[PDB]
């Protein structure tokens, strides 16, 4: 070989760059952010610190997140959702600022999607305090006429949590409901704890021990 | 030969061959060519390589027991073949132990695995595992040699033997066994919690079978050594033990034929690929 | 003395 | 603005030693391979050393190797050629030339300005019969180039390179792999020939094309240069 | 409101006025093309390993 | 307003009646006497063990030797197919690529996806490295397919129900094509590049004139998203590949499907369509992890390029017809011959 012998070395060198890049990129905990319009996606993205997609990379307790917000896609999800397989978890904003059924439809579609049967849906019931306020004047039955219970924050929040949990028709996967008042810094710590539990589960799957 | 112990031993090992060679061949095919080199797969790949080496060498044990004397092959031939066998065996053992440690680490330290547990790390540790096995089986390479012992030369050899056998016993029995028990105990414990509570049953079944098969396979092989340091051959118990030694070897090898089914095809991906390739 | 007929693999 | 500037050459004693350097800018020096091309004050080019991208592979001629060493200072974009035990044959000027290899690449596509210097057999060889050629504007001329072994390789490439060293200027690549015009070369050059005999035509010659033409094999290191064609107006 | 339907009907008009040929002729043209170029298609017919760059 | 609805119904029915008149025969009839293509038992001649993630597109240079591959790994890799040497590995501004194109000259590569912009790369900038020559922002949705007409003109298809023609030299939308009611997920320019057809998730494919902008023909055979589209090598027909598990051979001059390909053992959707140079083979790709080589005339499955471990995202025959390369979510590109 005369000088394609050097093209071979070029190919191997940039293959090595590919290998290093892949290793570097694998570490990042991919997370997909979903939720209805204005449902507080931006607000958590902001509190965690740091047009068709806006990756919000940030690092917490040695663990680098990559929170992908896809809200700019006014297009059919099924044609690009498959790009987001292997997102270690879905982070799902619910705005209890008002009513929400659209949010249940979105959650049902997302957690039952053939692509996400192994993907845990972390589920932030944000704006808890405003929910408590509206409950004091506007009952939860305005959202769920079937709701048969005492109209109170402590009950309604658990009822909403149970509703969203119930859309998980495959026992293979978890849902991690955590309340949030949209005015706290523990949120990223919550995401971290849920993500570490999900990482444990998804490693044990691959080991065949689970 | 018509001695009860050897006539059992030949059956169980020839079986070990029949189960293992297709088993380890299938698993090596799947893991090394049919599937990615990911960390979850590389452990099984190295394990099936050691297991397949053990299976490939097992026919020597079959023939050796069959004649029950002499030695067809050369002096270097016997200096290697036993050594290759023990290398495959303890490489399998240490790969089981490293599989257990990885399974524990991904539960005990998820964030650290998310950062540092990559194929480079896994392959480096596999290299270290083969290194330690090779070092642990050069003490046979240095002394395993021919002997007269009949009208036809037969391979055999005899502080020094204590120093090698007790070291091998400790490193191949207590260390891997205790590490497996600890790791699986921790994994079962952490399974108590959150989303894992439903799966303690599955985790405990897997833990206990993969540890129990290991235990029954290896415990005789290890305990006969300390028994051979407790008592001599040319005694009723002594001759008994040296006759059942062949069954002990048979069980130690049987672990190797179990290992593909018990680790690789115990995992759904390896099952799917073996079905999709046979 | 103690060598005996090892089944290999030892 | 692609730029490539040699330095470090000067007067030195017989049997002395020196360090040459070439500082690149305007191009990804890290990804290119680097060449050094000798030129005695009144002679044709000679290939000195080649430093690959990533510095994995390094080559030297028999008249240089055993006395020279080279290295790339990748982050500063400066290639270093170290030379020792200089004999009178080392009185040459040393050009700095970049190359990169991939399907469709053009090695030797840019040359430095050349750092002057002074001291107070089984491989491929090539020849040009057109040592001198009287030519005129508007005429057409054909430099003739041959080799001892065929430059046509089994993969279908023929590794003949044509360079023009205009008077006072640095060598400019005209034709690479014996047919391909290097970038910026006018349409009026062409390469031809196959096997061991080669020819390059200059159509509609102009005074701007005057100078001495060189023909180089790239089939295997050492890259022997031809004695060149002194095309004179 | 109107302009979108207007664009739809305009496109439908301009397509409806487009010329056409019988299906038999078009199918025959595809047949003819395939038959004419049947030789130079190393996938339709194998290329020998002595020739094939991917041999 | 309602008069326009009546006009639309009656004009569509006029087109339907005109095609009912033009349906004097069908390719499945007239081609009956032509011989079977036999067992097309191609073999994998190379596997491009490059990308570490889902390959979403791959495209062939006009030299029929260099193929560019795009992956979710955020890399566009140039492949020397005869040797599987990598010649460029281009780190994208966005990992979420969903299309890839090679300029016919071999000078530029185009790329894009969920970033909603098309990135034009210069493979032969004098600085050596592959710099972004232009970024074609302006789609309100993911850029779904890209195809050069030449080094300057480039057509795009995007999630926001539109296809657009740009000047890659200056970045303007020279002309924009509208008329889809759904995502325009597919694109193919005619061999002479004078017009192109795009398949949209509105279950239709539409013909566009690059110079006039007019949408003079529309094809409506499928009942699903048309994931793939490809001109017949003569430029007067094109294959539409849909998630409805059926490839369909439309004819420009016939103005509707000549023949529809289907077999009921297949239920996966089509991810790609690719004729062989003669026009006799249609190497359609399926989500079932296999590509099935259809006899394009007799409409008979004539062989299968099975061997990928995951869905095949793209398939392309070399411009000279030597080989067909398919890329898959298994992260490998296979060269079939």
DSSP, residue by residue, B51-87: HHHHHHHHHHHHHHHHHTS--SS-HHHHHHHHHHHHH
Q: Tokens at residue A136, please?
A: 């004091």
Total number of domains constituting chain A: 1
Looking at the fold, whether D111 and D157 belong to one and the same domain comes out as no
Cβ within 8 Å of residue A24, ≥6 positions away: none
Which residues in F lie closer than 8 A to residue D4 (C-beta atoms)? none
* Chain C interface with B: residues with Cβ < 8 Å: 1-10
Asked if B102 and B43 count as a contact pair (C-beta separation under 8 A), the reply is yes
Residue for token digits 């002309």?
A: F175
A150 close to B (CB below 8 A): no
Q: Which domain holds residue D21?
A: 3-119
Q: Tokens at residue A210, please?
A: 């689970």
The Cα–Cα gap between D34 and D49 comes to 8
F57 close to A (CB below 8 A): no
F66–D27 C-beta distance less than 8 A: no
The Cα–Cα gap between B171 and D145 comes to 72
* Residue A106 belongs to a domain: yes
Long-range contacts of A12-15 (CB under 8 A, 24+ apart): A13/D53, A13/D54, A13/D56, A14/F77, A14/F86, A14/F88, A14/F89, A15/F50, A15/F86, A15/F89
Residue from D115, D23, D149 nearest D76 by CA:
D23
Q: Do chains E and F touch (3 or more CB pairs under 8 A)?
A: yes
The Cα–Cα gap between D118 and D18 comes to 11
Question: For helices A153-166 and A101-111, what crossing angle results, to 10°?
Answer: 40
Residue from D47, D96, D51 nearest D223 by CA:
D47
Asked if F27 and F260 count as a contact pair (C-beta separation under 8 A), the reply is no
Q: Could you give phi then psi for residue A139, rounded to 5 degrees?
A: -70, 160
Q: Do chains B and A touch (3 or more CB pairs under 8 A)?
A: yes
D220–A2 C-beta distance less than 8 A: yes
Asked, as a colleague might, if the bond just before A58 is cis with ω within 30 of 0, I would say no
Give the number of A-B residue pairs with CB atoms closer than 8 Å.
Answer: 67
Total number of domains constituting chain B: 1
The Cα–Cα gap between F218 and D72 comes to 60
The shortest CB-CB distance from F183 to any of A18, A22, A76 is to A76
Q: Which domain holds residue B244?
A: 4-277
Query: According to DSSP H, which parts of D27-87 are helical?
Result: none
Q: Which domains does chain E have, with CATH numbers?
A: 2-54 (4.10.260.10)
Neighbouring C-beta atoms of residue A117, cutoff 10 Å: 12
Neighbouring C-beta atoms of residue E29, cutoff 10 Å: 18
Q: Tokens at residue F199, please?
A: 């398949």
Residue from A33, A32, A39 nearest A125 by CA:
A39
The shortest CB-CB distance from F128 to any of D28, D103, D104 is to D28
| D68 membership: H or E segment, kind and range | strand D68-73
For the domain that residue D46 is a member of, what is the CATH number?
2.60.40.10
Total number of domains constituting chain D: 2
Please measure the distance between the N-terminal and C-terminal CA atoms of chain D and give it in whole angstroms. Answer: 31
D103–F80 C-beta distance less than 8 A: yes
Which residues in E lie closer than 8 A to residue F44 (C-beta atoms)? none
A136 to each of A129, A151, B133, how far by Cα in Å? 11, 8, 70
Cβ within 8 Å of residue D35, ≥6 positions away: D47, D48, D49, D50, D51, D96, D97, D98, D99, D108
From D102, D119, D136, the end of a domain falls on D119
The Cα–Cα gap between D142 and D231 comes to 10
Residue from A172, A29, A176, A199 nearest A92 by CA:
A176
E41–F277 C-beta distance less than 8 A: yes
Distance from CA of A14 to the nearest CA of D (A): 10
The Cα–Cα gap between D93 and E7 comes to 73
HSE on the CB side for F325, CA within 13 Å? 29
Q: Could you give phi then psi for residue E3, rounded to 5 degrees?
A: -60, -30
The Cα–Cα gap between A143 and A196 comes to 34
Q: Solved how?
A: cryo-EM
**D101: nearest CA in chain F?**
F87
Which residues in F lie closer than 8 A to residue E25 (C-beta atoms)? 253
The Cα–Cα gap between F60 and F282 comes to 17
Residue from D103, D78, D91 nearest D46 by CA:
D91
Query: What is the side-by-side strand order in the sheet with D58-60?
Result: D58-60, D45-51, D33-39, D93-99, D110-111
Looking at the fold, whether D11 and D99 belong to one and the same domain comes out as yes
Looking at the fold, whether D79 and D57 belong to one and the same domain comes out as yes
Which residues in A lie closer than 8 A to residue B107 (C-beta atoms)? 200, 203-204
Which residues in F lie closer than 8 A to residue D25 (C-beta atoms)? none
Q: Which domain holds residue F257?
A: 1-337
Q: Which domain holds residue A64?
A: 28-207
The Cα–Cα gap between B254 and B220 comes to 12
Which residues in A lie closer than 8 A to residue B113 (C-beta atoms)? 199, 203
C9–B89 C-beta distance less than 8 A: yes
For the domain that residue B79 is a member of, what is the CATH number?
1.20.1070.10
D2–F126 C-beta distance less than 8 A: yes
Residue from F115, F122, F117 nearest F138 by CA:
F117
Looking at the fold, whether D114 and D146 belong to one and the same domain comes out as no
Looking at the fold, whether D36 and D103 belong to one and the same domain comes out as yes
For the domain that residue F180 is a member of, what is the CATH number?
2.130.10.10
| F125 membership: H or E segment, kind and range | none
Q: What resolution in angstrom units was achieved for this structure?
A: 3.1
How does DSSP classify residue B260? Answer: I
Residue for token digits 């929910």?
A: A131
C5–B158 C-beta distance less than 8 A: no
Residue for token digits 């062409």?
A: D190
């Amino acid at each position: 070989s005369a000088e394609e012998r050097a093209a071979l070395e070029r190919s191997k060198a940039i293959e090595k760059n590919l290998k290093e890049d892949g290793i570097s990129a694998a570490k990042d905990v991919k997370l997909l952010l979903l939720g209805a319009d204005n449902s507080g996606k931006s607000t958590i993205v902001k509190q965690m610190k740091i047009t068709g997609i806006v990756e919000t990379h940030f690092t917490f307790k040695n663990l680098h997140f990559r929170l992908f917000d896809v809200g700019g896609q006014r297009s059919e999800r099924k044609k690009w959702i498959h790009c987001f397989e292997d997102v270690t978890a879905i982070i799902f904003c619910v705005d209890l600022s008002d009513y929400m059924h659209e949010s249940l439809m979105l959650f049902d579609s997302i957690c039952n999607n053939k692509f996400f049967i192994d993907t845990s849906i972390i589920l932030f019931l944000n704006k808890k305090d405003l929910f408590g306020e509206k409950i004091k004047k506007s009952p939860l039955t305005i959202c769920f006429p079937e709701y048969t219970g005492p109209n109170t924050y402590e009950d309604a929040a658990a009822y909403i949590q149970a509703q969203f949990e119930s859309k998980n028709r495959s026992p293979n996967k978890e849902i991690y409901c955590h309340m949030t008042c949209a005015t706290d810094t523990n949120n990223a710590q919550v995401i971290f704890d849920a993500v570490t539990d999900i990482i444990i589960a998804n490693n044990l799957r691959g080991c065949g021990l689970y | 030969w018509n001695e009860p112990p050897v006539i059992l031993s030949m059956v169980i090992l020839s079986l070990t061959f029949l189960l293992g060679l297709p088993g380890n061949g299938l698993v090596l095919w799947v893991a090394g060519l049919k599937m990615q080199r990911t960390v979850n797969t590389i452990w099984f790949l190295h394990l099936t390589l050691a297991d397949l080496l053990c299976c490939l060498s097992l026919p020597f044990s079959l023939a050796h027991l069959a004649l029950q004397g002499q030695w067809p092959y050369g002096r270097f031939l016997c200096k290697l073949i036993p050594s290759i066998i023990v290398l495959n065996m303890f490489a399998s053992v240490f790969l089981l132990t490293a599989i257990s440690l990885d399974r524990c680490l991904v539960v005990f330290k998820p964030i650290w695995c998310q950062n540092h547990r990559n194929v480079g790390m896994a392959c480096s540790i596999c290299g270290c595992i083969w290194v330690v096995a090779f070092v642990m089986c050069i003490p046979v390479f240095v002394y395993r040699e021919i002997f007269t012992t009949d009208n036809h030369n037969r391979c055999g050899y005899k502080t020094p033997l204590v120093a090698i056998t007790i070291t091998r016993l400790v490193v191949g029995f207590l260390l891997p066994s205790v590490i497996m028990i600890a790791c699986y105990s921790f994994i079962v414990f952490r399974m108590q919690r959150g989303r894992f509570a439903k799966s303690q049953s599955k985790t405990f079944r897997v833990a206990v079978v993969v540890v129990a098969v290991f235990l029954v396979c290896w415990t005789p092989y290890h305990i006969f050594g300390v028994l051979s340091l407790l008592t001599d051959p040319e005694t009723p118990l002594g001759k008994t033990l040296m006759s059942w030694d062949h069954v002990c070897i048979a069980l130690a090898s049987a672990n190797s034929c179990f290992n593909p089914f018990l680790y690789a095809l115990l995992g759904k991906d390896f099952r799917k690929k073996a079905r999709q390739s046979i | 003395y103690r060598a005996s007929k090892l089944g290999l693999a030892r | 603005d692609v730029q490539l500037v040699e330095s470090g050459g000067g007067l030195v004693q017989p049997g002395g030693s020196r360090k040459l350097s070439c500082s690149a800018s305007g191009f990804a020096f890290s990804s290119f391979g680097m060449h050094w091309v000798r030129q005695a004050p009144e002679k044709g080019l000679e290939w000195v050393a080649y430093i690959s991208s990533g510095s994995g592979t390094i080559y030297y001629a028999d008249t240089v190797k055993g006395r020279f060493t080279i290295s790339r200072d990748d982050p500063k974009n400066t290639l270093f050629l170290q030379m020792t035990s200089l004999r009178s044959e080392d009185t040459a000027m040393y050009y700095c030339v970049r190359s990169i290899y991939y399907y469709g690449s053009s090695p030797f596509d840019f040359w430095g300005q050349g750092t002057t210097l002074t001291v107070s057999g089984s491989d491929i060889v090539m020849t040009q019969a057109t040592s001198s050629v009287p030519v005129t504007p508007g005429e057409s001329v054909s430099i003739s180039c041959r080799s001892s072994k065929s430059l046509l390789h089994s993969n279908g490439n023929t590794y003949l390179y044509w360079f023009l060293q205009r008077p006072g200027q640095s060598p400019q690549l005209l034709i690479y792999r014996m047919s391909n015009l290097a970038s910026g070369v006018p349409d009026r050059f062409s390469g031809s020939g196959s096997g061991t005999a080669f020819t390059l035509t200059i159509s509609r010659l102009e005074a701007e094309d005057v100078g001495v033409y060189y023909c180089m094999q790239h089939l295997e290191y050492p890259l022997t240069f031809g004695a060149g064609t002194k095309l004179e107006l | 409101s109107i302009a979108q339907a207007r664009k739809l009907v305009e496109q439908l008009k301009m397509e409806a006025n487009i010329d056409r040929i019988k299906v038999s002729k078009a199918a025959a043209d595809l047949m003819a093309y395939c038959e004419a170029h049947a030789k130079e298609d190393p996938l339709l017919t194998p290329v020998p390993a002595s020739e094939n760059p991917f041999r | 307003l309602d008069q326009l609805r009546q006009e639309a119904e009656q004009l569509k029915n006029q087109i339907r009646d005109a095609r009912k008149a033009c349906a004097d025969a069908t390719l499945s009839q007239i081609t009956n006497n032509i011989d079977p293509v036999g067992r097309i038992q191609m073999r994998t001649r190379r596997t491009l063990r490059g990308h570490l993630a889902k390959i979403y597109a791959m495209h062939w240079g006009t030299d029929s030797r260099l193929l560019v591959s795009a992956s979710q790994d955020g890399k566009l890799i140039i492949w020397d197919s005869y040797t599987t040497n990598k010649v460029h590995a281009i780190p994208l501004r966005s990992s979420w690529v969903m299309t890839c194109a090679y300029a016919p000259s071999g000078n530029y590569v185009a790329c894009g996806g969920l970033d909603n912009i098309c990135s034009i790369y210069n493979l032969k900038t004098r600085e050596g490295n592959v710099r972004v020559s232009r970024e074609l922002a302006g789609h309100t949705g993911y850029l779904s397919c890209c195809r050069f007409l030449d080094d300057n003109q480039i057509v795009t298809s995007s999630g926001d129900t539109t296809c657009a023609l740009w000047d890659i030299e200056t970045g303007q939308q020279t002309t924009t094509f509208t008329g889809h009611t759904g995502d325009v997920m597919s694109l193919s320019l005619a061999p002479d590049t004078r017009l192109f057809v795009s398949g949209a998730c509105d279950a239709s494919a539409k013909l566009w004139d690059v110079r006039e902008g007019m949408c003079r023909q529309t094809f409506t055979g499928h009942e699903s998203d048309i994931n793939a589209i490809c001109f017949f090598p003569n430029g007067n027909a094109f294959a539409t590949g849909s998630d409805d598990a059926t490839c369909r051979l439309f004819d420009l001059r016939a103005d509707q499907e000549l023949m529809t390909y289907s077999h009921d053992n297949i239920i996966c959707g089509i991810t790609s369509v690719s004729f062989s140079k003669s026009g006799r083979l249609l190497l359609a790709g399926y989500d079932d992890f296999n590509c099935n080589v259809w006899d394009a005339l007799k409409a008979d499955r004539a062989g299968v390029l099975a061997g990928h471990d995951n869905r095949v995202s793209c398939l392309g025959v070399t411009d000279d017809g030597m080989a067909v390369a398919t890329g898959s979510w298994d992260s490998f590109l296979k060269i079939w011959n």
